[PDB]
Amino acid sequence: VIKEFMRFKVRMEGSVNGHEFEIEGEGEGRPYEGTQTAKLKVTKGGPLPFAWDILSPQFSKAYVKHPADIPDYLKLSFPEGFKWERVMNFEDGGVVTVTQDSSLQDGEFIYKVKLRGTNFPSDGPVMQKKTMGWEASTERMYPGDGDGDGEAELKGEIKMRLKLKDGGHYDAEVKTTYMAKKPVQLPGAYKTDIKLDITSHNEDYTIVEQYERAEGRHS
Ligand SMILES: [Ca+2]
Questions:
Q1: Rg (Cα) of the chain, in Å, rounded?
Q2: How far is the CA of 177 from the centre of ligand 1 (A)?
Q3: 3-state secondary structure at position 41
Q4: Are 198 and 56 in contact (CB under 8 A)?
Q5: Every domain of the chain and the residues it spans
Q6: How far is the CA of 150 from the centre of ligand 1 (A)?
């Protein structure tokens, strides 16, 4: 059901320091090649009074290139799909939590994202829009119980680095649990290299285009 070319649709509802918003978007890519693009539109609550960059990594791990010796847990979860839950802890105290549901309907992926950002300084780089994109990341993947029910799924850990407009970087520690909706064979531990780029945007970041490349490899 996962073709060499696949489209997706995404909707995000969220709030950051109490500012509520909604985003709708579409994307496409080559799931076995590890490449994808997305175009997002702020449909409620725009222009956003915070950095787009804290949202960009929440808009698609079915598009990770895996070698044949790493079981592709998230691709194998389809057509039913998978869920993921994420916590990002930023170095100045900010917190972002996310829940996501991924399914396959009528030939395209459907992504439903819920996001809450809290504990951000009112004068910090996120609420003042003083960031300019993510450095490349390496996510450490490993089997484990992330939702506390005693049964293993797939976990990921990342140290992410956000570029600051004034120079230097703003770090976040990220933990994600990925849960297939049906029993799927789990891989052993491995690493995924990821780069997410903002490829275009309008003046107030109410229309934004993204490009991501991701590839798994042995540790
Ligand atoms: Ca579990």
A1: 17
A2: 9
A3: strand
A4: yes
A5: 6-217
A6: 6
